[PDB]
Amino acid sequence: KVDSFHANTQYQHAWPLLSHDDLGNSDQSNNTKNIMYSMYMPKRNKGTAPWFRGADTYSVKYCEQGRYEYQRYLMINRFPSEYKKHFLSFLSNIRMSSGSATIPQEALHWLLRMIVDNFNPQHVHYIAAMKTLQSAGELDMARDVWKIMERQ
Amino acid sequence: ARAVIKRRSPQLWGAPGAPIIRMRGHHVVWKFQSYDLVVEHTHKRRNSDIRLLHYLGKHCPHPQKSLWSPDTPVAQDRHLFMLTTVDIDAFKYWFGVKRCRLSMKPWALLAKAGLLPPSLTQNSKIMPKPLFDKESLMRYYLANRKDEDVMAREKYLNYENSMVKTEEERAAERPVAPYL
Amino acid sequence: RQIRPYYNLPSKSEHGRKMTGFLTPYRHWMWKQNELWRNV
Amino acid sequence: VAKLQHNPAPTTLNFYEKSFQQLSDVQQRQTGLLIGAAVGDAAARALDGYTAEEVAAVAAESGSLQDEDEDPVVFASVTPREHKSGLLRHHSYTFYLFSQLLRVMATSRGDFPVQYVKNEWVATARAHPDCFVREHASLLHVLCITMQLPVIYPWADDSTLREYASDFLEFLTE
Amino acid sequence: TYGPHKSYKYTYMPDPRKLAPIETTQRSEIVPQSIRPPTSYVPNHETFLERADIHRLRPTSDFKASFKDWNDLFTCDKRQLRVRGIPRMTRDAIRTAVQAFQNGNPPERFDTKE
Amino acid sequence: VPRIYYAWMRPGSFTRRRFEKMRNPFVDLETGTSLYFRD
Amino acid sequence: FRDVEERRHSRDVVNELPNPWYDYVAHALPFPDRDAGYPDEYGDLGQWRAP
Amino acid sequence: SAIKRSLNVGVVGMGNMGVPIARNLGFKARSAMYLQIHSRALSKAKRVCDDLSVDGATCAMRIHDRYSTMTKWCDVIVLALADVKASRHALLEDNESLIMNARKGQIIVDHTTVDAETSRECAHEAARRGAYFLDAPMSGSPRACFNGQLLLMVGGDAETFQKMLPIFHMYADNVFHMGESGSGTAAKMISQALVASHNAAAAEALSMAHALGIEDQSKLVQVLDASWGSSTMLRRNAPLLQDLIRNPDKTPPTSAVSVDRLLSDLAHLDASLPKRGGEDEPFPVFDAALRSLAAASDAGMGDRDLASVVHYIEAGEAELRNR
Amino acid sequence: LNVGVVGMGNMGVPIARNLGFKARSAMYLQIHSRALSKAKRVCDDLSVDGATCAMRIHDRYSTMTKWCDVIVLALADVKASRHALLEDNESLIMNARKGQIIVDHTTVDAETSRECAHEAARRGAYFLDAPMSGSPRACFNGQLLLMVGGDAETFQKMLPIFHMYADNVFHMGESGSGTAAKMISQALVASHNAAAAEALSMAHALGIEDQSKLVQVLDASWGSSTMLRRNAPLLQDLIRNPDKTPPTSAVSVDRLLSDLAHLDASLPKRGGEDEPFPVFDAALRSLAAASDAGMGDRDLASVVHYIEAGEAELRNR
Amino acid sequence: ARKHGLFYGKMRFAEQKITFYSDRFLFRDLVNRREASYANVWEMDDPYRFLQTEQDYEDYWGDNYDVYRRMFPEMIGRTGEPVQQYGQMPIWAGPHRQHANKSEHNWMFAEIGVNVGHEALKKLELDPTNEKRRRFVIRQPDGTLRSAKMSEMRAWYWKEEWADFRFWAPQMEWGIENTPSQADFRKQRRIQSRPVKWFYEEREVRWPDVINAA
Amino acid sequence: STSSRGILIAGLTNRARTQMAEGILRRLTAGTIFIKSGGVHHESTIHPLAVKVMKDIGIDISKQSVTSLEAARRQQNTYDVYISIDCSYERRTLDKSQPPRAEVRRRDDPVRYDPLLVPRTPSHWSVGVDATDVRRRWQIWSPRDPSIFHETSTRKFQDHLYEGEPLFMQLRQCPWRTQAKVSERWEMDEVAIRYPVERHSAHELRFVQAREQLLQRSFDLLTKLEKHYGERLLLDRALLEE
């Protein structure tokens, strides 16, 4: 009896192929009669409607830009005390001895973080990195440090 | 370290303690409950505006039917789906360099992704746990022991470095006739 | 947490904990078997 | 046109059956070279050493066939003579040495120096000395290994392909 | 045909994923549930239950009559355990003791009530 | 009054003409309609 | 355990296939390598908090 | 030659047990049938199609109001009506009846429980026409149809039975080939007799329990189930039987399978048993169950559940006294 | 606790063996017998096969009752059970303690259980009756049906003891409902066997040849029963070859009729001159006709030949 | 499909974007795209040459046609991407834990963080040719690790409901107007990809010198 | 005249191994006892290779039928034996289109493990539920229900696409094997699905070799059941000699 009572009061037969709109306008057949009804709808909705920007695309620059092309050169300013603090911290991190919990690659990593943070590594930082990597036996990494200096 | 301890949520080694991957829930009926893999302190901070250290991802514990069945149907692609988003780079950062802790529920969830081995508590009820004998273990080790240099080089490749240049690459990088 | 099996040294004290926390030498041995399976 | 499933017929036969539909026209042949080489080698494995008269004898002996059951030669159930191990149970040494080059090419993602695979091939040779002496410096062996290279760039002039393959042929003929 | 559109297979144009089949598989397909036979230490389910009873708020020993046999105790899941009418804590204690026995840890723990 | 009332009942529209027909089954649509909304 | 597992894994063929999730880390840097469009350095009509 | 096509399967009855068959076929066709839905009331047929479509089918559906269109469209037909009279009207008696108008190779299956002679005539005239007829009485509730758990006792050509197994397995779990030409009807007849006997036995047993003073009906059912004697009919009717005995004034509920249904089914047995010359009375307990069910039906309780027999055992005995 | 077994018939010795085996010295075991040599033999056999608890052997109900806490009777006949429980001078229930428990497993009348329970309640003890159904091999293996009727808390106290020799133990209610459960179960078994005979005879009359398939059809349909599932494979041959004598079985027509003989006494009145029992009475008619034909000890599948006689008494009476 | 009493409308433009009459370069781009585009594309044209089998034809055109046409807005010869598989890392626990990772459900994981999850970069982030794909992974209920299919990968971004039935890229003009012209991180990336078995073994590698054969 | 209330033979499919086991048990018991063989998925047909291989020994299972044991699940407490035929959990593959995987070899191409470090399943342990111990639970959430049609209804397996869910299947557990008096699990590889390249002769040889194991297993089961009930069940005993 429940199935007998529960009839299809919800759905309606689909749209035929070339059917019109509920306002009577149509595309490719009814032209300049079609009206725009986006201004009758409420100005704001408290949650995106199923048709909210469903089809939206972006420029091809976004998908064809190279990597790191968008980074703009801005000069970060900091106090001289901050400069001294950060330079000493980076030098200590570079000079941290390997073996226990740090691996020799970490000296090069900490040299590169100086660059990525918009710091100018000093000749003392370069000397420390080369010395530590040579003492660890990473001569190729030492030459990599030299090449980083030159590229800077 | 409180005169009267928080009886219902005790911990180890005080606050805020080491970072930990927990599977945080929401104050919602189970019917909509979903979890989020977050990195946080052992003693949950509900004082600062910063509740957690990093948001690794989200997990939906309710299976969803495969909406993608027609697309190149592969073996058993119609089984229900359990959706999850995971930050693998941040997870590797916090797991490796920061040596944070990992709860068993997140460990089991991540073992499904190929990022970690099956958990210690994901024990099959069938096989009993092993029984060890020093003599048999020694016999096996001697029977097939690796050699010093191969063992050391495998360890070095796994932990210390993986970009070791060949003689050919060193020669290619080596500068050429003009020398300027 | 630490398991207190019924068969370790009991403290015959009525002013504290009724079971001590020591253990029989068998419990020492089997605990290693669990320790090793955890170590792998 | 879909028939009634009185039995639990499988929706898809192979994992990559539907994946091969999603390959461009040229990519289908690019992949087909490698997959067909593997399939042919795996079909020929069971009868690798058999002479022409012996394969004919196998075909004659296996004379029970249904409508389209199978041809006895493609994956013959005849017991092989040499017991092998690892992949050699299903593929020849030439294809063993072929697959390592395929893997190196796949991980390399395009053309690459021969040094990326010199050592893989040398380890294979050290592992299987008898097959190494039996098949090394052979025209068939070298050509079978080297048919791969064009798939790195299906349309390149003969000069480009030959200069590219000169290094691999150098090492395989040394 | 039933629908007004004699041209459409489905008159209501349901989403083609409404009709997508849903396959299924049971945890039994993956792993079985073996039953660990009673030992001399806990010969029967009542002994198991009284051994599991250690806590004053988890009176597992009050429900020896809630299970028919060793296998009935060991096969009943959390849902049937609740249906039989057991408190939350006693239910969880019974389930955890059974699972520990399955994993190889018998119910051997010191009664903390005193 | 609905929010799309004006689009629905704008004179000369398909919906407005249908309403006019259903209100008077045998009007002359070219001249039998009303410009205004007033009832 | 490790040695038996490693010999088994090497002798297995399917698991020799590469795994992008376990093999490497991609972009361990603090910032994206390309511009996703954001940020928008301009307010909005409903927004009074300009800076 | 022919053209690749999807076999046309039609469903005729659509009673309580007819529409579940169509729903199962529509859900499980997977676009291989182009199902047909015949009904005397085209409103009823269209309602079935609309509900099935909104619930979501996997095949197209065609509504039918008269048997000629069904004959010409369907390749296979399944017919599940209420009464043997309606089955006869559809299959043989009507001017445009299916069997009387069957095409070469067409297949017809009946699930309505009809008489052995009716099935024999249907199969014989179908064979004359050249088509094939399988008499496939079914057992199981509409709930069992929804779950896909029905018994089918098919009698007919083994070739056609094997060909039609894929369609049967869409709404019937236990499908057996009892033989040919009425074997299924005989099996269903025996099953109905057994059901009646066991229902009477269970009613008497639970009355015994109440009289002896047992109120733990669930525990009694458990003991019987684990013990040497227990029937599916007792397990089915036990709760209702106790609920109905304990308060004797309570009117029995109405169910799809009813006393009139059993009586109509057993009338075919009364017709088909032999030894009319010896007045065919060798079955005492079956006679007693028939008596009690007849008393229940005469009591105006013929539309209710089979459990109503409790209130009418003694009425049947009084009728026996009146002999 | 001290549990003592007194029955020691043919079905009682397995109870004593199982109690001794599974006691594991956790509960004390007592054995009583009418003759001491038999009980000495039983204790010797149990010890030779393994005895965990010291066992004591009794010739007298006085010692039996004044020593043990639980008494378990597994006797042969109602008269023997009544002798043990009430009418004896050293009667167990008469001399019962204020707290000891007595259980009876022999199939006695509802009224017998009534007097037993009433006297136990008078003396302050708890008596609950648990008629048993099964085979002696089922007792050996530890499978039995016990349907106990009595106090709920005492039943709970008795659960562990029962499981030592029983698998399926149920509580049918208070005041000796176990005997009613056993009695009604037997009546229902007889009725289902009769109905199965009818169905198979009718199938043969209709001329359906393949009974192998019809057995599964009936088992999967409604109205199925274990009695059909059991007697079908024999009945098929027995109806097509009515000449062969039905084979002997442990469960017999005489046993069913003896166990049904308590129904008349347990029912309220027979003077109504009518049967409020159509199916059950029809089954009884055929069972009695089979017994009077010299086929009493044969199988339960013999109802087919005497169903026709099951109508003569209905017509004449 | 529609429901009762909702009076659905019609959408005239797929998206809100600047018209092509507003710029000389947008006008030229549209003219070139139209010339490279069809006007009416049928089941026989080039874009459908990937339906090489009659079963492919029937399954594409019979049902789930909406799904197939919506899997990608642009018109290509694939309607999807091939799947592949990944190797499972060695479990040192062994057969004690080989039973894990087998479940009743497909587990899908999609990567997030910086450099991932940007809508503007969608076509580049799920492009197989990109070194930095989003690395989706599916674990099957039988423990298999596989990549994701194009639709599963595309389901993790914002909805995109439109199609292009007339632009077919291969017929773009070439050689008249369209005549395209032209640190050690790349070496380091090649080193990363390169096999490293040589570390265990100018001392150039040579074939084995056979000893048993002498 | 037997004391057994029946024996069930559960399987995932009821095509080849369950049918052959039913035939062998029926022949050995000479039809004196009830045997019901069922599978979880009934949408199948008895395999012609199974029929031919059973004929080669003398039993024709051609009359039997593929059916599921849903009816017997409601009565599971009455049947006395619960044989369950299934594949090994180690070689099991959820993809029917592949040969079985390799077992774990204990103690050189396969890696052989230590029996102490990787112990086997103890044989004295019983099985609670195997793959053959499940029951189908059909369900449907129609949009015609006004509570399921509402936008915020959780009776769905999706969101934003449609409402409700058409007829779908789910498998429940039936942990009642142990309720039976004799429950056993028989480990046999699949035989009803042909490997990608197999030839009919080898596909039939697999059926034959599985028939041998089914025969021996049924003989052992009947011996232990004879010891259990105490009666004689190997009434035929004509096949074991060969």
Numbering used by the authors:
A (entry chain DD): 52 to 203
B (entry chain CP): 9 to 188
C (entry chain Cd): 10 to 49
D (entry chain FP): 2 to 175
E (entry chain Cp): 12 to 125
F (entry chain CE): 25 to 63
G (entry chain DD): 661 to 711
H (entry chain FM): 2 to 324
What does the paper say about this structure?
This process is assisted by a dynamic network of assembly factors. Mettl15 is a class I SAM-dependent N4-methylcytidine (m4C) methyltransferase of bacterial origin that modifies the mtSSU rRNA at position C1486 (human numbering).
Using the data from recently published structures of mammalian pre-mitoribosomal intermediates, we analysed the T. brucei maps and identified a number of previously undescribed structural elements. Structurally, RbfA is anchored to the complex by its N-terminal extension, with the C-terminal domain binding Mettl17 and the C-terminal extension binding Mettl15. In total there are 43 hydrogen bonds and ten salt bridges that stabilize the Mettl15-Mettl17 heterodimer, which contribute to two main interfaces.
